[PDB]
Structure 1
Amino acid sequence: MASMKKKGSVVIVGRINLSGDTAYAQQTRGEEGCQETSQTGRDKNQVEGEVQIVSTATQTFLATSINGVLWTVYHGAGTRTIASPKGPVTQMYTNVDKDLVGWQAPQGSRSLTPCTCGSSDLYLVTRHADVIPVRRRGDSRGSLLSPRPISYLKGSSGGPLLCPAGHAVGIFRAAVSTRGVAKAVAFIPVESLETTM
């Protein structure tokens, strides 16, 4: 039992900047710093914004702050801690049945407001700062107005679906594809987050 390894923390490595007129990705930590922070769980970098780019040793994806919780997908984070200025922080929400986890939102982040608009005209934010129009098609599904290869959506699980007013409608979970083309997306609705809380 002496030689058993511990899994590393999820690390914030950047963010999707939605502040101004143009959305763009920003990197805040390179691979070497990410690997070290994952092992120690100590991340002293200042955190800003609503959508974080996160990484483990083996995967990279997104995490989104809604209502003071940084939310992401279980298939990316598993049960891992997240790195913080004072060490690894345990998940406050874990739900494998929803493909959902969450931690307390980091100091300095900004939280999205849960949408109460009832609008079906949505916008998916990807890790490459693409803002993709999506028509809501059900409680947990939306169709892309312009389909595209699934490669463009890989790595964007945990990102937000937003309403026209910039409220959070859901967390991107899975892509619905035909012959490698993404025609629709599946997401965790914000109401399911609000219930989990």
Structure 2
Amino acid sequence: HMASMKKKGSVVIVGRINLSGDTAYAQQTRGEEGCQETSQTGRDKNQVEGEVQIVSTATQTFLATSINGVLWTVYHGAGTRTIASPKGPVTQMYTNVDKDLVGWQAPQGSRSLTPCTCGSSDLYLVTRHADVIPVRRRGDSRGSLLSPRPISYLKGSSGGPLLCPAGHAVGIFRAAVSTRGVAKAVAFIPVESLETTM
């Protein structure tokens, strides 16, 4: 009934993928208990850094990527949820279920990737474990892994970027094409589709 109706928590940044040096690695910035509390209050005082964030709800963990001052992720991870911030919950500025896409203003202190205009098909997928996986572009929204691997290795990386050789953002990882549990290809939201939404 109305008195007891609950509110879903915010998405919470719990880590990041460090791409600042010669070695990519995941960093945790908040543990599960603090995540639970921050999801309820929507108030996250932690300092944010970098381009790729690891984010969590009470029930799911995935990635989010800053491109042109917007933190983008997948709707199948975030739904319509706010994101926690130093001054409380922040409402989405983009929501498009048809593209499996949502976005919030990028957090104070993040760095944004630049949308790719190279027109190159040699891509790199960045996972939540900081693996950098070469992917050949195979269409507007598909790419093949040069080295297939079990889908287990990609789980939790939706919202992560596909990058060009120069480090520009080409798209946002959405879904994996699985054959007998092996990911041979991935689907992604092209950056042009984000730029249109913008």
| TM bin (shorter chain) | over 0.9
Distance in 2 of aligned mates of 1:177 and 1:195: 29
Structure 1 residue ranges (4+ consecutive) displaced by more than 4 angstroms after TM superposition: none
In the TM superposition, what is the alpha-carbon distance from 1:89 to its structure 2 partner?
Answer: 0.2
Q: What's the TM-score, normalizing by structure 2?
A: 0.99
Cα separation, 2, equivalents of 1:177 and 1:43: 36
Instruction: Report the alpha carbon displacement of residue 3 of structure 1 after superposing the two structures with TM.
Output: 0.3
Secondary structure of the structure 2 residue equivalent to 1:173: strand
Q: Secondary structure of 2:48's match? A: coil
| SS across alignment from 1:2 | helix
2:98 is paired with a residue of what secondary structure?
coil
Distance, in Å, in 2 between the alignment partners of 1:100 and 1:31 is 25
Quote the offset at 1:189 in angstroms: 0.1
Q: In the alignment, which residue of structure 1 is the partner of 2:102?
A: 101
Aligned with 2:99: secondary structure? coil
Q: Residues 36-58 of structure 1: CA distance to partner in whole angstroms, max 9, x if unpaired?
A: 00000000000000000000000
Partners of 1:67 and 1:19 lie apart in 2 by 18
Q: 1:85 Cα deviation (Å)?
A: 0.2
**What's 1:5 paired with?**
6
1:22 shift after superposition: 0.2
In 1, the alpha carbon distance for the partners of 2:19 and 2:115 equals: 17
State the aligned residue count. Answer: 197
Shift of 1:96: 0.2
Mind listing any 5+ residue stretches in structure 2 that lack a counterpart? Answer: none
Question: Per the alignment, in what secondary structure is the counterpart of residue 4 of structure 2?
Answer: coil
Instruction: Give the whole-Å Cα distance in 2 for the aligned partners of 1:92 and 1:2.
Output: 29
Partner secondary structure for residue 97 of structure 1: helix
Q: CA deviation at 1:34?
A: 0.2
Deviations 1:118-137 (A, max 9, x none): 00000000000000000000
Distance in 1, matches of 2:149 and 2:29, equals: 28
Partner residue in 1 for 2:191: 190
- The CA distance in 2 between the partners of 1:158 and 1:168, in whole Å, is 12
Aligned equivalents of 1:18 and 1:117: distance in 2? 20
RMSD: 0.2
2:129 corresponds in structure 1 to: 128
TM-score where L is the length of structure 1: 1.00
Question: Equivalents in 2 of 1:22, 1:142: separation in Å?
Answer: 24
Aligned equivalents of 2:52, 2:11: Cα separation in 1: 15
Distance 1:95 1:80 in 2: 13
Q: Quote the Cα distance in structure 1 between the aligned partners of 2:16 and 2:166.
A: 20
What secondary structure does 1:80 align onto?
A: coil
Deviation per residue, 1:137-191 (Å, 9 max, x gap): 0000000000000000000000000000000000000000100000000000000
Post-superposition shift, 1:93?
Answer: 0.1
Aligned partners of 2:187 and 2:121: how far apart in 1? 14
Query: Matched residues, percent identical?
Result: 100
